[PDB]
């Protein structure tokens, strides 16, 4: 669906460890590499707000 900006982030892996996959949100941040624990990211835009719910009663 082309109704947004970023919705995948097809990165690659850790620069120090192309094997170890950086994790999303470093303890409330960007992409944390479990091995070097490096954090990458900042954008990701702000979408969390538009409706975001599970069906309604009305
Ligand atoms: Zn690493």
Size (the chain), residues: 58
CATH of residue 3's domain is 2.20.25.10
The reply, when asked if residue 36 is annotated as ligand binding, is yes
The reply, when asked if residue 43 is annotated as ligand binding, is no
CA-based R_g, the chain, Å: 15
Give the contacts of 20 (CB within 8 A, at least 6 positions apart): 13, 14, 33, 34, 35
Q: Report the alpha-carbon distance of residue 12 to residue 10 in Å, rounded.
A: 7
Experimental method: NMR
CA-closest candidate to residue 21, choices 36, 3, 2, 42: 36
The reply, when asked if residue 27 is annotated as ligand binding, is no
Provide the residue range defining the domain that includes 11.
1-58
Domain count for the chain: 1
- Report CA(51)–ligand 1 centroid distance (Å): 36
């Amino acid at each position: 669906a082309s109704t947004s900006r970023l919705d995948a982030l097809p990165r690659v892996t850790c620069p120090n460890h192309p094997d170890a996959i950086l994790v999303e949100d470093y303890r409330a941040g960007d992409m944390i590499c479990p091995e070097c624990g490096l954090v990458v990211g900042d954008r990701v835009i702000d979408v969390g707000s538009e409706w975001r719910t599970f069906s309604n009663d009305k």
